[PDB]
């Protein structure tokens, strides 16, 4: 358990791809051309985590970029960072899929699935002990949602025992008004119950939600969205890029977080809520279980938790962290299950992330996040009635079929969060 | 001389068996590269202390100990340590991949595909030993590792060598410094398959010992290092009986005589006292009278229960240090009659009282001041069935829900294995019962 | 039959070959099997240019499919803001009710097009109007907290 692969998909997952690339590197001191300019250690007991070693003091990502657009190619390269990844790993096809997620999984992305898992072959036999794969993505779109729904079924295929990790970008009418996302979200959804182990639900109803309401941000940019989510991937890699103790396996986390196995859909948190270019233990105990500090738009008040995993980072007294943790579990003591005990995780880290002594970082896996499902469950069923599109996908290979068992997969999905919420120890 | 091997699994059992060599080798004095000036035979013996340590034709004491752990993190740390020189390197067996906290993975799947290693190594141990009479195994209850390649080893071991003894150190989950949340069902689980491989096993409850040292040594915040430390004084007050003169648990089968009337109740409970801070030099000497006192208050056992709910069925006292008969039985006189100390009908009712005159022997760097006299208690009081009610507890609390079921049934392990554990362990409580509790 | 092909050229926007059709006497109040007429497809496809030369040529501004769909929920429902206005200037019901009992006001309050929320609230939409499941569209903004449609039903 050490070396971890990273793909990221499509312009979204390509998008908040770079951005954890570019924050990450600059805790372990690594700058672009990929040498380490920090002044103190622990930055690279962990590094191979995520990174090679390519000779000369030089560091490169294990990281694998894939998208139909070639336009997304000139963008990654144009970036800060856009030069530590390797000219290997770069694939990139012909014509985007215009938001069908069809041309995804059936038809486009298909004639580039090969040309992907080539590339996943030689970074899998350059690692040691691989422990699994993460992927950043988008499930609005077709490319990085169509697509990187099947790249996940077929990396699994050949790596049955390695643990499939992802960030999905749950699609929203306040950044993106466009009606054919409800259709890719819950397509992919369906592939996501199956073929993942732990995949970080982030949505952009709560990230404009955050920049509007809370930072003030009157016309919120992908940029201001983005900043907020290479702040809560960092943080919930945190045990992962430094020692710290507590391990660093995706596995452990995968058999403490996930206790049915169709119910890995993770509610991350992040605290203080910092701009782009803009606390004590008890402030930081406070937002973590704060509804305007979660990542995905649900009010964990109105389920309860399952299990709760909590990162804070910087210089603190582990002794009050034990004081404040132990406290909320208490005034919130109704909002977490009784037949799971013990199902909070507390993890202190030294190093914090840059600009801030302190931070704090949630992973709850709440069955509040239903009320996620249920938003876009609904506006599937207000376009799928009406048979609006619905052509666009037929004339692919898809069928009628496959849309009616994704949308009875994800109301599935809400009964069973509904289950376990009314469940009774006695 | 009977010589005993020790088996250290997993993160818990190397971590406190690293530190139990460490004082076993200030104790009998022996240098870490192995050296004991003063031995005076070089190249063997016929010695007591010779059944924890091989002398090879250099005078280097070895250790008859076997680090297994399913992956390297931790027992690097040995290769690497100030003990470096001291082990067999062929002895610090490790893995690639660990348990990941999962019972089925340590026992089914990736515990298969060592334990033929294992084996071998302990058989090479085992055939340098002239009358090898057990094993000591040293594991976690809650890791994947732990719980479940320890019940691996332990029924290879009862085919293996179906004539020796086997006791363990069991490390008992508690909620203050637990790493999983499925700990209680893997304390489960290899408590059924082990109930039948072992003979006796002495339970360390990790929240005892914490408690301890937040109160007597004024330790805030706790850590393995302070816990181990501890642990590893207590451990070597219960060995110590093999390794020196005595004629109180000289051998294994001793231990099981004197300790476990009926097979399957075979946990005693380990009271120790007194625990001083390293802060108090010029502490008041506590009295033979006032160190067998405080063995009868639950503020000083190693698993949380009390003794006053139960009955006794056997009481062994470990003396070290200035410590004179004649006070013995008269603290002992005493402490008999002003508590409310029951044992069952169908026992002697009687204390066995072993004393070593050496003083206790602590560790530089520890927190554990130098006392003159300490004693060590093994009782067997049905009370312990306390941490059996608790710990069933929590595993009835997920189970009737089937919440983590899928990670053991994934791996090679059935759902069926998990009722025929619990069916067990209500056998074991009930087994308390008739005894009376 | 050029209704046939009047409902494909009103799909994909062929501005030219609508007009073509109806000068030689192309039913522009033709369906397909679903009950589908030019105007519905139109206003689907977001062709606003298709809409006007049907409306000024017999269309049935409030024609319903087998579903109960006119064409104004379709536009809602898909957001075409400068479909729905031109509608309502032709005499679109604003109030009309589907199958399922939905409303344009809850297809656009559902796909979270506020600006089509407030262009019908000003022509008169009932917001006490329950669905088959009793949820108006004021429920619908309360169910899934969305403070920014709750706000504008509150005017
Ligand atoms: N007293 C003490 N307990 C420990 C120590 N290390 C781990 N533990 C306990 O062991 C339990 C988990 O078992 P581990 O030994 O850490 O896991 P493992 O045996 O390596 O098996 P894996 O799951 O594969 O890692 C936890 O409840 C810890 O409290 C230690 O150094 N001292
Ligand atoms: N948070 C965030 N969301 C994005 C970003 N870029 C695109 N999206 C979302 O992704 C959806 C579009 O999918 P996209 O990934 O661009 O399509 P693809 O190129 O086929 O993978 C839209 O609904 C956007 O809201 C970004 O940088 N940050
Ligand atoms: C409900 O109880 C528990 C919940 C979560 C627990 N551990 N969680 C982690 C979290 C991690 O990173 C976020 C790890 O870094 C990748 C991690 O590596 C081991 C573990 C532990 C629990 O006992
Ligand atoms: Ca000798
Ligand atoms: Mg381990």
């Not at chain 1, 404040?324 to 109704?334: G, I, R, T």
């Not at chain 2, 069933?392 to 791996?411: C, I, N, S, T």
């Amino acid at each position: 358990m050490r070396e971890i692969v990273h793909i990221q998909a499509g312009q979204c997952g390509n998008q908040i791809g770079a951005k954890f690339w570019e924050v990450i590197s600059d805790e372990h001191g690594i700058d672009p051309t990929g040498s380490y300019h920090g002044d103190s250690d622990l930055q690279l007991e962990r590094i191979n985590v995520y990174y090679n070693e390519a000779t000369g003091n030089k560091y490169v990502p294990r990281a694998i970029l894939v998208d139909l657009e070639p336009g997304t190619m000139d963008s990654v390269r144009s970036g800060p960072f856009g030069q530590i990844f390797r000219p290997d790993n770069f694939v990139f096809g012909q014509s985007g899929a215009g938001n069908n997620w069809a041309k995804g999984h059936y038809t486009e992305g298909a004639e580039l699935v090969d040309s992907v898992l080539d590339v996943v072959r030689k970074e899998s036999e350059s690692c040691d002990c691989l422990q699994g794969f993460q992927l950043t993505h988008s499930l609005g779109g077709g490319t990085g949602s169509g697509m990187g729904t099947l790249l996940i079924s077929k990396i699994r295929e050949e790596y049955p025992d390695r643990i499939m990790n992802t960030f999905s970008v749950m699609p929203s009418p306040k950044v993106s008004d466009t009606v054919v996302e409800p259709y890719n979200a819950t397509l992919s959804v369906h592939q996501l119950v199956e073929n993942t182990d732990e995949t970080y639900c982030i949505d952009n109803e709560a990230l404009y939600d955050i920049c509007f309401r809370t930072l003030k941000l009157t016309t919120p940019t992908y940029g201001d969205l983005n900043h907020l989510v290479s702040a809560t991937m960092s943080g919930v890699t945190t045990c992962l890029r430094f020692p710290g103790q507590l391990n660093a396996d995706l596995r452990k986390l995968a058999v403490n977080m996930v206790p049915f196995p169709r119910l890995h859909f993770f509610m991350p948190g992040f605290a203080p809520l910092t701009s782009r270019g803009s606390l004590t233990v008890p402030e930081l105990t406070q937002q973590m279980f704060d509804s305007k500090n979660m990542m995905a738009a649900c009010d964990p008040r109105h389920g309860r938790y399952l299990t709760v995993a909590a990162i804070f980072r910087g210089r603190m007294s582990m002794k009050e962290v034990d004081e404040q943790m132990l406290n909320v579990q208490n005034k919130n003591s109704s909002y977490f299950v009784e037949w799971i005990p013990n199902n909070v995780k507390t993890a202190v880290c030294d190093i914090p992330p840059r600009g801030l002594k302190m931070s704090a970082t949630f992973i709850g896996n709440s069955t509040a996040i239903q009320e996620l499902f249920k938003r876009i469950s609904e506006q599937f069923t207000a376009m799928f009635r009406r048979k609006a599109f619905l052509h666009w996908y037929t004339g692919e290979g898809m069928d009628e079929m496959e849309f009616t068992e994704a949308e009875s997969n994800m109301n599935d999905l809400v009964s069973e969060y509904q289950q376990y919420q009314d469940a009774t120890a006695d | 001389m009977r010589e005993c091997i020790s088996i250290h699994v997993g993160q818990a059992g190397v971590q406190i068996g690293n530190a139990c060599w460490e004082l076993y080798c200030l104790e009998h004095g022996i240098q870490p590269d192995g050296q004991m000036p003063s031995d005076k035979t070089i190249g063997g013996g016929d010695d007591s202390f010779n059944t924890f340590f091989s002398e090879t034709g250099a005078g280097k004491h070895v250790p008859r100990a076997v680090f297994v752990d399913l992956e390297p993190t931790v027992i690097d740390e040995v290769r690497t340590g100030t003990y470096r020189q001291l082990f067999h390197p062929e002895q610090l067996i490790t893995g690639k991949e660990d348990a990941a906290n999962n019972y089925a993975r340590g026992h089914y799947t990736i515990g298969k595909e060592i334990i033929d290693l294992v084996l071998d190594r302990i058989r090479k141990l085992a055939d340098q030993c002239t009358g090898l009479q057990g094993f000591l195994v040293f594991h976690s209850f809650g890791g994947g590792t732990g719980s479940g390649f320890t019940s691996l080893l332990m029924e290879r071991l009862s085919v293996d060598y179906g004539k020796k003894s086997k006791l363990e150190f069991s490390i008992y989950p508690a909620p203050q410094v637990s790493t999983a949340v499925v700990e209680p069902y893997n304390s489960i689980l290899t408590t059924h398959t082990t109930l039948e491989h072992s003979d006796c096993a002495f339970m360390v409850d990790n929240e005892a010992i914490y408690d301890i040292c937040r109160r007597n040594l004024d330790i805030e915040r706790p850590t393995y290092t302070n816990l181990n430390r501890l642990i590893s004084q207590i451990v070597s007050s219960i060995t110590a009986s093999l390794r020196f003169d005595g004629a109180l648990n000289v051998d294994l089968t001793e231990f099981q005589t004197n300790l476990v009337p009926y097979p399957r109740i075979h946990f005693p409970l380990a009271t120790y006292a007194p625990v001083i801070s390293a802060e108090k030099a010029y502490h008041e000497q506590l009295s033979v009278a006032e160190i067998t006192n405080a063995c009868f208050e639950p503020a000083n056992q190693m698993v949380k229960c009390d003794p006053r709910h139960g009955k006794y069925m056997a009481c062994c006292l470990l003396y070290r240090g200035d410590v004179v008969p004649k006070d013995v039985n008269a603290a002992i006189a005493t402490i008999k009659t002003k508590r409310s100390i029951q044992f069952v009908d169908w026992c002697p009712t009687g204390f066995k009282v072993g004393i070593n005159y050496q003083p206790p022997t602590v560790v530089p760097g520890g927190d554990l001041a130098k006392v003159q006299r300490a004693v060590c208690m093994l009782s067997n009081t049905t009370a312990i069935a306390e941490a059996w009610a608790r710990l069933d507890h929590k595993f009835d609390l997920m189970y009737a829900k089937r919440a983590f079921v899928h990670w053991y049934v994934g791996e090679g392990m059935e759902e069926g294995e998990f009722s025929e554990a619990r069916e067990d362990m209500a056998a074991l409580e009930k087994d308390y019962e008739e005894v009376g509790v | 039959d050029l209704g046939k092909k009047l409902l494909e050229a009103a799909r994909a926007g062929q501005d030219d070959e609508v007009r073509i059709l109806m000068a030689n006497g192309a039913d522009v109040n033709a369906t397909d099997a679903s009950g589908l007429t030019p105007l519905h497809l139109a206003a689907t496809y977001g062709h606003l240019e298709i809409v006007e030369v049907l409306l000024k040529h017999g269309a049935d501004v409030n024609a319903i499919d087998i579903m109960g769909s006119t064409p104004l929920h379709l536009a809602a429902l898909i957001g075409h803001l400068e479909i729905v206005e031109v509608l309502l200037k032709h005499g679109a019901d604003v109030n009309a009710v589907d199958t399922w009992g939905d409303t344009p006001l809850h297809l656009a309050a559902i796909m979270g097009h506020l600006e089509i929320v407030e262009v019908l609230l000003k022509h008169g939409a009932d917001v006490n109007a329950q669905d088959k499941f009793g949820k108006t569209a004021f429920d619908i903004s309360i169910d899934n907290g969305n403070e920014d449609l709750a706000e504008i039903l509150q005017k």
